[PDB]
Short mmCIF file of C-alpha atoms in Angstrom, two decimals:
data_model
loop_
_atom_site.label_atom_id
_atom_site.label_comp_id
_atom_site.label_asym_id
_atom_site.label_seq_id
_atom_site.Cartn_x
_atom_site.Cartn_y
_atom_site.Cartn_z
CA UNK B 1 41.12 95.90 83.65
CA UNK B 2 44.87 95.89 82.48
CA UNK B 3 47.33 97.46 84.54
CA UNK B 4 49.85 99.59 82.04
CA UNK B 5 53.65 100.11 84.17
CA UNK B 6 54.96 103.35 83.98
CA UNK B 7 58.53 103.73 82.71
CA UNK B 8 59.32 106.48 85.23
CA UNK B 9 59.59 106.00 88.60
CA UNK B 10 56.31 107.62 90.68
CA UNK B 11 56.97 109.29 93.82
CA UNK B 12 58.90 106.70 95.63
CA UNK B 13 32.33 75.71 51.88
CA UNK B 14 35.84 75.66 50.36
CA UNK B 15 38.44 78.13 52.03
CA UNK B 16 40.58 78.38 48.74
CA UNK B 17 40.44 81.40 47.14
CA UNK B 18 41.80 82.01 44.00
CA UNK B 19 43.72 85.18 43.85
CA UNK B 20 46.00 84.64 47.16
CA UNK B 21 48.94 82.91 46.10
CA UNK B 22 51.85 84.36 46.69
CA UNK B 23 53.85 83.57 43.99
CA UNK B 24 55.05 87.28 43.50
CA UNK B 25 59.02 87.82 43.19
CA UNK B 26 59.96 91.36 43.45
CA UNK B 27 62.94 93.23 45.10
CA UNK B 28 62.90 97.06 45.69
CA UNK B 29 65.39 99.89 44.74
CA UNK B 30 66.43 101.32 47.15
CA UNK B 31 65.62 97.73 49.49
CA UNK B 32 63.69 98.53 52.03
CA UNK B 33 66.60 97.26 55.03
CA UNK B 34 68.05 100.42 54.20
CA UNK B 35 66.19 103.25 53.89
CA UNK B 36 64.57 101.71 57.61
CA UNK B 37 67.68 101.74 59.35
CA UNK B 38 68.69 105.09 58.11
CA UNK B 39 65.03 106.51 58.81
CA UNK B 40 65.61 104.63 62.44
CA UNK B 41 68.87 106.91 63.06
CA UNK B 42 66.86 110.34 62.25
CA UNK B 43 63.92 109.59 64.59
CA UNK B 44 66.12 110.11 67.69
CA UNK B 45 65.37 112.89 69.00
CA UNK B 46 67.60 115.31 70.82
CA UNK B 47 69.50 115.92 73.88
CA UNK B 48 68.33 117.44 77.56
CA UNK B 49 70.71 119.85 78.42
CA UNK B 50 70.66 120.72 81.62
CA UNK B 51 73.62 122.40 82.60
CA UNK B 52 73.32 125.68 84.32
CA UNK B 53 70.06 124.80 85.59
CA UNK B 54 68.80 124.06 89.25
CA UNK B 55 68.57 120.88 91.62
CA UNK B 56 65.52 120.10 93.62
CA UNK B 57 67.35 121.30 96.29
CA UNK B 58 68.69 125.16 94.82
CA UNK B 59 71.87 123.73 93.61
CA UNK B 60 73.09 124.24 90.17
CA UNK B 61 73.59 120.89 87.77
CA UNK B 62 77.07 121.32 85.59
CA UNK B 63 80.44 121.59 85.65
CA UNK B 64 82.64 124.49 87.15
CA UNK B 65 84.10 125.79 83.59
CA UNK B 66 84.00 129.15 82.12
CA UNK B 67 81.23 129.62 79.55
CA UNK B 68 83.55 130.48 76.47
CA UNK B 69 86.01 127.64 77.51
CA UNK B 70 82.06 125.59 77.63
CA UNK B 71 81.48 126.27 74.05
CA UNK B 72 85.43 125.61 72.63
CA UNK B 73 85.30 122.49 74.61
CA UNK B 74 81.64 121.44 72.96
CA UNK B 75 82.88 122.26 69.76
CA UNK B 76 85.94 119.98 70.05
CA UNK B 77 83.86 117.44 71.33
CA UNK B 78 81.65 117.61 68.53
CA UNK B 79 84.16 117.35 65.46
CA UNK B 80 85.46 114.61 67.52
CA UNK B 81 82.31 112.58 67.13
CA UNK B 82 82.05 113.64 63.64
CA UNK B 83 85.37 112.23 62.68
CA UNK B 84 84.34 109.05 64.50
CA UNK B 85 80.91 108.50 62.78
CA UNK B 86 82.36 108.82 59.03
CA UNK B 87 85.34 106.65 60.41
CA UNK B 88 87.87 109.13 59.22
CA UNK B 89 90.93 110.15 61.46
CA UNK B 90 90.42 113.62 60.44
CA UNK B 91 86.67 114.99 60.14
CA UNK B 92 85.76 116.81 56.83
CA UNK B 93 83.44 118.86 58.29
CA UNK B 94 84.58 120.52 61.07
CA UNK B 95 83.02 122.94 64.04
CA UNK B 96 86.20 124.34 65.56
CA UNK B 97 88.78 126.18 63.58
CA UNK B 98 86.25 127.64 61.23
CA UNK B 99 87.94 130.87 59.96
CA UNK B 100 85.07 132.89 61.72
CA UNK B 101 86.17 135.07 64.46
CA UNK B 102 83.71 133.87 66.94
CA UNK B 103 85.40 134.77 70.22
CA UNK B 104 82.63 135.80 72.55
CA UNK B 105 80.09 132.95 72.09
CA UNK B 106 78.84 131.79 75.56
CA UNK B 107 77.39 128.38 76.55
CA UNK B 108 75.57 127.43 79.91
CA UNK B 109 77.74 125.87 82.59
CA UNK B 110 77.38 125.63 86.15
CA UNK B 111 80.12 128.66 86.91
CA UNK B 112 76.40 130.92 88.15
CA UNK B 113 73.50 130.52 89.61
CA UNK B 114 70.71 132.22 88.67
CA UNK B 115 70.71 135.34 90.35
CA UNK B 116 74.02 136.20 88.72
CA UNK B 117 76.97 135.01 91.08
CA UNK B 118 79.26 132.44 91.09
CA UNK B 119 78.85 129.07 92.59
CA UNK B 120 82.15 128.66 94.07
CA UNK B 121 80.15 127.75 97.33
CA UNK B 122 76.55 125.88 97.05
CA UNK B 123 73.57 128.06 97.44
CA UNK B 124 72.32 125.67 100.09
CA UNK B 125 75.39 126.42 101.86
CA UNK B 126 75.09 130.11 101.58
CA UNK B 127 71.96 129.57 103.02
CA UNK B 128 73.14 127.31 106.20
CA UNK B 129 76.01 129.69 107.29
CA UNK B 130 73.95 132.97 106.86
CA UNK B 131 71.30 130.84 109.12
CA UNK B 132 73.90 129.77 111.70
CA UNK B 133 74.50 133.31 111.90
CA UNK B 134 71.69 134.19 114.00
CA UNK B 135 71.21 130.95 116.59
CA UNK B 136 70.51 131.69 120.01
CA UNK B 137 70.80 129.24 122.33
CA UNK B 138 69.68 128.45 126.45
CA UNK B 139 70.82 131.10 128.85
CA UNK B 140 73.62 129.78 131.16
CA UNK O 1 109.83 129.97 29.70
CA UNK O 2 107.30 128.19 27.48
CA UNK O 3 103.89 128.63 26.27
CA UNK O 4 100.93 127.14 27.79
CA UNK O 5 97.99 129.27 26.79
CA UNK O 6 96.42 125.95 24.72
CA UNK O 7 96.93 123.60 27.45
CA UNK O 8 95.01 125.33 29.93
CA UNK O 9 92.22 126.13 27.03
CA UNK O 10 92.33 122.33 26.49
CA UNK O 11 91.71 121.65 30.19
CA UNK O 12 89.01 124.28 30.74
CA UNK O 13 86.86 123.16 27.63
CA UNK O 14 87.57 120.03 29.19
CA UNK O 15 85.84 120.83 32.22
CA UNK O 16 83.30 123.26 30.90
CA UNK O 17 81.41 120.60 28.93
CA UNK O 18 81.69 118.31 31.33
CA UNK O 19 78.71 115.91 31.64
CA UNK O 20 77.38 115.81 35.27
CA UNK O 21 73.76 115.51 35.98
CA UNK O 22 74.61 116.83 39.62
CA UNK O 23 72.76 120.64 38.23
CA UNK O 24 69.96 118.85 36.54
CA UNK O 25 69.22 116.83 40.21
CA UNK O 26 69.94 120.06 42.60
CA UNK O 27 67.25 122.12 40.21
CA UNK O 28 64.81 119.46 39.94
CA UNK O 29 65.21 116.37 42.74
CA UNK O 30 66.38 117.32 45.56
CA UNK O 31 63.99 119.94 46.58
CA UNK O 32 60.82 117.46 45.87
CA UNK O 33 63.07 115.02 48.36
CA UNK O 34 63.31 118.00 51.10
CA UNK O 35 59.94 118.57 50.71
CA UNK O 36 58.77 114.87 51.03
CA UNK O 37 61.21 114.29 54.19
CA UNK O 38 60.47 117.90 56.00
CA UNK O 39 56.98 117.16 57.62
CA UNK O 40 58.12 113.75 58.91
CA UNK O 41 61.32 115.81 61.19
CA UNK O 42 61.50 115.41 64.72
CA UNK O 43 62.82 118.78 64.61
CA UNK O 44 60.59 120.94 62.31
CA UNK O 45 62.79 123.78 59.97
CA UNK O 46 63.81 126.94 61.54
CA UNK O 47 64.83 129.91 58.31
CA UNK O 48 65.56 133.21 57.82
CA UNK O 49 64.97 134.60 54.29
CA UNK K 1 72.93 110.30 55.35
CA UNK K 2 69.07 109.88 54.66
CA UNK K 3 69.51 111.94 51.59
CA UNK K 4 72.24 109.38 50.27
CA UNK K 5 70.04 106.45 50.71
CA UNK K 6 66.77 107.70 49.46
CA UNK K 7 68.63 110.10 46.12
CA UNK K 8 68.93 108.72 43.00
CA UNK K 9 71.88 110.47 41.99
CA UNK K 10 75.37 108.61 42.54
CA UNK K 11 78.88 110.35 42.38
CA UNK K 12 81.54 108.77 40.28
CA UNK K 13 84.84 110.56 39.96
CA UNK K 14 86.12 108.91 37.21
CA UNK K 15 83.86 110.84 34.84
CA UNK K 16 86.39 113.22 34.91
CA UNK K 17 89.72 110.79 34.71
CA UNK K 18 88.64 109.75 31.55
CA UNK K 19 87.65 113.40 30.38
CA UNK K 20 91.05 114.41 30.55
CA UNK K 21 93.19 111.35 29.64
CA UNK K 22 96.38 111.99 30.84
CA UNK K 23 99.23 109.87 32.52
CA UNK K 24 102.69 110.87 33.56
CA UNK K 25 105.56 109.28 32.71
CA UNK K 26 107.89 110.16 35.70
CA UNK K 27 108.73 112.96 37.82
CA UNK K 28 110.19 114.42 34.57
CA UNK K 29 107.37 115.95 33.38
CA UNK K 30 107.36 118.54 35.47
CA UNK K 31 104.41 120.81 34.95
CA UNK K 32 101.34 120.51 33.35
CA UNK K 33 97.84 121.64 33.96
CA UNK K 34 95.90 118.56 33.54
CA UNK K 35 97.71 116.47 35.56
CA UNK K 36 97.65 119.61 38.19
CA UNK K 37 94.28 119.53 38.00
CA UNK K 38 93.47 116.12 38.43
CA UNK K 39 96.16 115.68 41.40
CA UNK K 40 94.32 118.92 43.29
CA UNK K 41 90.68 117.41 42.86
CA UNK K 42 91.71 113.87 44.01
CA UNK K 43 89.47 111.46 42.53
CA UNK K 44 90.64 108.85 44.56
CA UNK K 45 88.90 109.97 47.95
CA UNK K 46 85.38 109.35 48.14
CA UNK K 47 84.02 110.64 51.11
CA UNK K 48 81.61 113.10 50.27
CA UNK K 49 79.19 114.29 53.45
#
């Protein structure tokens, strides 16, 4: 029986008949090249994001950046690759600057953990130190 | 200083019987295009009304 | 950019160049609505997304 891989790492009479001929000379509109390769660009799907979230250890996956800075900074970033896809210098449609006063929008960084404080120290760290502060060790 | 009240009539005649087809498509077109692309998304619709 | 492929509908500014049908001279003439118009809508671009 076949073994399948996995893509993700594991744990580790005359023949002739008379109506075949092709003979036929058509070309489509629209051509067929491009609808496929701009059907081909919307079947990606989206992104993972998983900032803010933990590590297998307790340790939060992200960047140490305020949440409202997060979302400016994303927006940027965005309009940026905007301008870059329709080759402009300058993109037409834009996602900062809008003339909405959107000022306290949040996004998911790795500033907190989950039960609310900041992660200006590792959790696992937390964790060692308050441990350390109970050793005992042999009597003299 | 001068009068201009028939050049600006002029102009918006001009552009008020203007012959687009861009209505005609947006009332007839595009929604049978939505609706032929919208079941084939990878990320299905998501409206308010 | 799957609607522009698959739409029949096409966009051609100079529908409206020809609609109005007016050139300058110079710098001279100064105002005018039609040529107003026409430099404000800017058929010359033609990125529309």
């Amino acid at each position: 029986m076949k073994r399948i891989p996995r893509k993700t790492k594991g744990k580790s009479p005359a023949t002739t008949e008379p109506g075949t001929s092709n003979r036929e000379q058509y070309k489509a509109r629209p051509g067929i090249a491009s609808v496929q390769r701009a059907t081909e660009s919307a079947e990606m799907p989206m992104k993972n994001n998983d900032e803010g979230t933990p590590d297998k250890k307790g340790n939060t996956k992200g960047d140490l950046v305020n949440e409202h800075s997060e979302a400016k900074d994303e927006a940027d970033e965005a309009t940026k690759k905007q301008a870059k896809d329709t080759d402009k210098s300058k993109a037409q449609v834009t996602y900062s600057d809008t003339g909405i006063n959107n000022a306290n929008e949040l996004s998911r960084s790795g500033n907190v953990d989950n039960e609310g404080g900041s992660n200006q120290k590792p959790m696992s760290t937390r964790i060692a130190e308050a441990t350390s502060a109970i050793v005992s060790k042999h009597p003299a | 200083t001068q009068s201009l009240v028939s050049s600006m009539r002029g102009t918006l005649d001009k552009l008020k019987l203007i012959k687009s087809m861009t209505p005609m498509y947006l009332q007839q077109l595009a929604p049978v295009e939505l609706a032929v692309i919208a079941p084939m998304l990878p990320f299905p619709p998501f409206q308010v009304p | 950019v799957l609607l522009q492929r698959i739409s029949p509908l096409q966009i051609d500014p100079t529908i409206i160049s020809n609609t109005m049908s007016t050139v300058s001279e110079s710098t001279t003439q100064t105002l005018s609505p039609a040529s107003s118009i026409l430099g404000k809508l800017r058929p010359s671009n033609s990125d529309f997304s």
